[PDB]
Amino acid sequence: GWLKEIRKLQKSTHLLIRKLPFSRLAREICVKFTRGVDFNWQAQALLALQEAAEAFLVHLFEDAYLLTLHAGRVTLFPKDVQLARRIRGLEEGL
Template sequence: MSPRDRSPMSPVTADSSPISSPHVLCPPLSHHPGDGPLYPSRAPGDVSPASLVACPLCPQVREICLMFTRGVDYYWQATALLALQEAAEAFVVRLLEDAYLCSLHARRVTLFPKDLQLARRLRGLDDGI
């Protein structure tokens, strides 16, 4: 409700109008900028879409699968790709959280590459990725 609508409106009756039948006159309704949102706002707990796009993920998964299976091409279910995507996102988010804690420990708020390297070293991920 906008501030314009908060004041009570006194109806105009037959006593003050030249028309003989009693009725209530209302001003025409109009929309003013800033009265309300144009779209419903989202609650903070709403589910957000996936961070990684699934389209480029499928060819990469297929390429890595071909490298490890010596040329045998396997089919992937959509649910398997979604599960792989969720796991990859969770891994990256957790790694970035640890790296940010490393930057806070160094009394900085900017995330540097050395923070990511330290987080990977503390997690024991030096050899792999």
């Protein structure tokens, strides 16, 4: 089952996170980063921000999985994600 799920997802291109939850998250981060002046967001700005975040996460998962296999496991762990971030090296992994 997971196999057909993987094969179906790897041939699709649509975004996997829901646009409205992603928008809420991005907006609350922005208001935490503000200096007392609120900002608006073009609809394309949030789509751009979500396209990049999902690509980043997918690539990070690929790297982390290689670490899982190196350790002889098939189950992805938080230590495999943490180590992939450490090897990527403080700008690509961050």
